[PDB]
Design a protein around this motif. Sequence first.
Motif, mmCIF file in Angstrom:
data_model
loop_
_atom_site.group_PDB
_atom_site.id
_atom_site.type_symbol
_atom_site.label_atom_id
_atom_site.label_comp_id
_atom_site.label_asym_id
_atom_site.label_seq_id
_atom_site.Cartn_x
_atom_site.Cartn_y
_atom_site.Cartn_z
ATOM 1 N N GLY C 257 0.821 -1.197 0.000
ATOM 2 C CA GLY C 257 0.000 0.000 0.000
ATOM 3 C C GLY C 257 0.857 1.251 0.000
ATOM 4 N N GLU C 258 1.803 1.326 0.936
ATOM 5 C CA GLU C 258 2.698 2.477 1.054
ATOM 6 C C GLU C 258 3.542 2.688 -0.206
ATOM 7 N N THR C 259 3.569 1.689 -1.087
ATOM 8 C CA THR C 259 4.331 1.787 -2.336
ATOM 9 C C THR C 259 3.461 2.350 -3.467
ATOM 10 N N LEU C 260 2.164 2.478 -3.203
ATOM 11 C CA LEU C 260 1.222 3.047 -4.164
ATOM 12 C C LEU C 260 0.927 4.497 -3.817
ATOM 13 N N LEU C 261 0.425 4.719 -2.607
ATOM 14 C CA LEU C 261 0.208 6.067 -2.090
ATOM 15 C C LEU C 261 1.408 6.939 -2.430
ATOM 16 N N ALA C 262 2.577 6.574 -1.915
ATOM 17 C CA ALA C 262 3.801 7.323 -2.188
ATOM 18 C C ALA C 262 4.043 7.478 -3.695
ATOM 19 N N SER C 263 3.451 6.580 -4.480
ATOM 20 C CA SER C 263 3.559 6.618 -5.938
ATOM 21 C C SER C 263 2.442 7.451 -6.560
ATOM 22 N N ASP C 264 1.587 8.015 -5.705
ATOM 23 C CA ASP C 264 0.435 8.817 -6.131
ATOM 24 C C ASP C 264 -0.614 8.024 -6.925
ATOM 25 N N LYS C 265 -0.898 6.798 -6.484
ATOM 26 C CA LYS C 265 -1.972 5.982 -7.065
ATOM 27 C C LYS C 265 -2.922 5.463 -5.971
ATOM 28 N N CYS C 266 -4.160 5.950 -5.997
ATOM 29 C CA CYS C 266 -5.064 5.877 -4.845
ATOM 30 C C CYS C 266 -5.981 4.659 -4.791
ATOM 31 N N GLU C 268 -6.009 1.807 -5.958
ATOM 32 C CA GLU C 268 -5.337 0.536 -5.675
ATOM 33 C C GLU C 268 -4.435 0.601 -4.445
ATOM 34 N N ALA C 269 -4.219 1.803 -3.920
ATOM 35 C CA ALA C 269 -3.608 1.941 -2.603
ATOM 36 C C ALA C 269 -4.635 1.555 -1.541
ATOM 37 N N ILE C 270 -5.905 1.842 -1.816
ATOM 38 C CA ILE C 270 -6.999 1.461 -0.928
ATOM 39 C C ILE C 270 -7.360 -0.013 -1.055
ATOM 40 N N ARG C 271 -7.789 -0.426 -2.247
ATOM 41 C CA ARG C 271 -8.256 -1.793 -2.472
ATOM 42 C C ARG C 271 -7.269 -2.802 -1.889
ATOM 43 N N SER C 272 -5.993 -2.422 -1.892
ATOM 44 C CA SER C 272 -4.923 -3.235 -1.312
ATOM 45 C C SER C 272 -4.938 -3.190 0.227
ATOM 46 N N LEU C 273 -4.805 -1.995 0.806
ATOM 47 C CA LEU C 273 -4.919 -1.837 2.260
ATOM 48 C C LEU C 273 -6.165 -2.532 2.826
ATOM 49 N N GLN C 274 -7.277 -2.457 2.098
ATOM 50 C CA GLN C 274 -8.464 -3.238 2.443
ATOM 51 C C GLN C 274 -8.126 -4.723 2.397
ATOM 52 N N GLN C 323 -8.639 11.946 0.143
ATOM 53 C CA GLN C 323 -9.886 12.505 0.658
ATOM 54 C C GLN C 323 -10.738 13.048 -0.474
ATOM 55 N N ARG C 324 -10.080 13.640 -1.458
ATOM 56 C CA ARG C 324 -10.785 14.196 -2.592
ATOM 57 C C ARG C 324 -11.093 13.114 -3.644
ATOM 58 N N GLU C 325 -10.638 11.875 -3.423
ATOM 59 C CA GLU C 325 -10.802 10.867 -4.471
ATOM 60 C C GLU C 325 -11.860 9.781 -4.279
ATOM 61 N N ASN C 326 -11.481 8.673 -3.656
ATOM 62 C CA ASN C 326 -12.375 7.517 -3.626
ATOM 63 C C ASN C 326 -13.351 7.537 -2.456
ATOM 64 N N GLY C 327 -12.792 7.869 -1.295
ATOM 65 C CA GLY C 327 -13.518 8.092 -0.063
ATOM 66 C C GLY C 327 -13.413 9.581 0.126
ATOM 67 N N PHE C 328 -13.662 10.095 1.328
ATOM 68 C CA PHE C 328 -13.708 9.349 2.589
ATOM 69 C C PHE C 328 -14.965 8.505 2.879
ATOM 70 N N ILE C 329 -14.748 7.336 3.482
ATOM 71 C CA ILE C 329 -15.784 6.509 4.125
ATOM 72 C C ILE C 329 -16.831 5.899 3.185
ATOM 73 N N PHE C 331 -16.426 4.550 -0.698
ATOM 74 C CA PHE C 331 -15.351 4.448 -1.666
ATOM 75 C C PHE C 331 -15.829 4.062 -3.056
ATOM 76 N N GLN C 332 -15.624 4.969 -4.002
ATOM 77 C CA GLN C 332 -15.719 4.634 -5.413
ATOM 78 C C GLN C 332 -14.844 5.597 -6.203
ATOM 79 N N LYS C 333 -14.284 5.105 -7.302
ATOM 80 C CA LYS C 333 -14.440 3.700 -7.641
ATOM 81 C C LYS C 333 -13.221 2.884 -7.170
ATOM 82 N N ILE C 334 -13.492 1.862 -6.356
ATOM 83 C CA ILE C 334 -12.466 0.959 -5.833
ATOM 84 C C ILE C 334 -12.648 -0.445 -6.427
#
Lengths: 18, 18, 389, 389
Positions: C257-266, C268-274, C323-329, C331-334
């Motif tokens: 996850g931390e390898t996506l976020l830091a890569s600016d990709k959201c 799949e940073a979430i769907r993974s952390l989930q 916060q401005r993207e899939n969520g908060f709370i 989530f789409q599109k995940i």
Amino acid sequence: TKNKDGVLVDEFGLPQIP
Amino acid sequence: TKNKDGVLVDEFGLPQIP
Amino acid sequence: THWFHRNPLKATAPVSFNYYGVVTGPSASKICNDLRSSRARLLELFTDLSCNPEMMKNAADSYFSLLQGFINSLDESTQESKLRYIQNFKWTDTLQGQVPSAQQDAVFELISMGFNVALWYTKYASRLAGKENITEDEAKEVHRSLKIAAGIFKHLKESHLPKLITPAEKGRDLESRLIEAYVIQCQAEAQEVTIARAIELKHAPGLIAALAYETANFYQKADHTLSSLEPAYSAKWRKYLHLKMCFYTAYAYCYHGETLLASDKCGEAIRSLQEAEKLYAKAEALCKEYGETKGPGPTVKPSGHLFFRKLGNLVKNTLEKCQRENGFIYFQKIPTEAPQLELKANYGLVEPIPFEFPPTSVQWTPETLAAFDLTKRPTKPKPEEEVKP
Amino acid sequence: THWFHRNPLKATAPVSFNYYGVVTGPSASKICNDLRSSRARLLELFTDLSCNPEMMKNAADSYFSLLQGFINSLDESTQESKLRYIQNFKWTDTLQGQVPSAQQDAVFELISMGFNVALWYTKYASRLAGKENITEDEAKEVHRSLKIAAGIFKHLKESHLPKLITPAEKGRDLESRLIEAYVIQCQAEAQEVTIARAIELKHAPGLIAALAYETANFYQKADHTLSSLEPAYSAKWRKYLHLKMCFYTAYAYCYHGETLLASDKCGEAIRSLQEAEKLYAKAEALCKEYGETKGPGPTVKPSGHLFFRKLGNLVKNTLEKCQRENGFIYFQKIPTEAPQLELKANYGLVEPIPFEFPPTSVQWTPETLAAFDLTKRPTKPKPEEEVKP
């Protein structure tokens, strides 16, 4: 020591840094 | 003023407090 | 801390090495007393919780180098000793409970003794890895020991089993499928330790992801390997490595996850952390009834979760730029199914410490051998139980 | 800021009030000149962006009190004036576009003029609510005006329409279903303002939830009410109040969320906050194609979202005490369908400011009335268009 690729390595096989 | 239940009220009909 | 499943030690009947008219002379008569006392010194050590590996190395060196005389000969490294089939050794099995298996082969005795030592090494690592007080230095030992063990097992499997006369039975430790699982398990367990270290020293998230991923592959492989045995004995074990591969895959998604976020990709940073936390949920579902599932060995209660203390930060940090993207709370599109992971790790992989037995004892000379006269050969005790803890 | 949909003003043909042999005398001849100039003063005001309500109150007082003479009589409050059916007034409709409707009834002219003033009040509130510079004091006006308007509409509906001779046609403003929707819409719009205030002064979350909820009920009701009209004209309107009830329900769940968390109840603090953001998503889905849907009135682009700046804190705060519970980031167990809300609000509800027309002008005396001799009665201009902005 170093590994095959030439990298300073922890005794645990890990990279070595501060 | 107050409302029916006896409560100090904002001109907007709301309760009044600090 | 660290938690590893441990199948029980192998037990064996006393071997006196007493031949009567067959042993003529002082030197031959001596060597049977050395084989007697040395095998017993090696056996008391197993049960003994006071023994360090350098003691163990010695006790084993002694025996195996004396044992060699019964297998091969000091003159031609290619030709076999007259004594190989002389004695009959009775050993029990890790998965087979109390049931002994017997062979009159010195190879059987060697492969099985050695197996017990490799098993020992891991147990030492395991007992040593239970404490909370773990020292950078004491980890090097737990880690090194696991490799010494993976090395021994490897050796026994592919250098030795081939030499056995009778084929090995399914579900016996001396089956090469069962050994193959130990080697792997050992390698895996070591890497767990490495991970534990890498995390502690703050190494790069990509690293710990790949190392943790490849480790889950190992319990994968050792599940498939073991998969060929009747579920009665392998039941509990298979559940624990089924459990472990699952607990370490969580680490994969999480640290990935931390390898996506830091890569600016959201998304799949979430769907993974989930996915990571979906799995850590299932992992504990597996711990619970592995505890229910009956099999050889004690039940190890899994200890460390900093997993959350890690996920926690990632969760916090992730929602911040997303916060401005899939969520908060909401989530789409995940993405529906979880993101595939094929990652290789360049650091922390374990290679089994290459093992070899000690050469045959110098005490074996042609005279010492000819002093066993087989021309003069003309009731049993029972396996002395392990009684572990 | 604030955003309200506005159907167009009603337009009407000039009425000269010129009767020839019928008006004998100075006083009767005067009153027709006062009805002429006063109606026109009232009409120029509508189009005029310089007009405050105290100007408006006056201009309307004048006309309606002069108009009364044509409806009822100064002697018996129960008996009707001889002039009621004398003149024929031609008015257009908010939803009907350019198509005029005519009646020779002074009640029709009154109900329709008044309707235009109530419509005016709201437009004044609406234009005044567009600015970012809103002052505590200027809100009291926008708010008060909406109630003056809701009051007028109410009056017209149930005190006046009954008196009309011909029944009113479906889709005409003078239909009581259509009025009923305006009254409600007005009440709703006011409460929006109250909400905007309550939020700004940090009132209790329970309050703002209930107030915002009851407000969504209003656009509910005005959607159902309007629902009986052919979709051609009501299309855009219905979408906007369909949109509004939806945007304010989001506020309900959102602000209700803070009433659960603070109450130490998590799963439904989440499922709700989700529901809020699920809805705020659909709300903008509705804004977008309300913009597509064609109908009378300009398209108002919805302004304020602090909604997020609110949800944001709740989200952050919620995950904090619920981190150990449903999530983080993978939520179970979170209830399938959304939590029912039945909440009544004890504060901020709007009651329409009771309205009444001004009593008949003192200029009407029996002599002034008898000076219109109907015994002596023996081509048309067209409705002068609105041209709003």
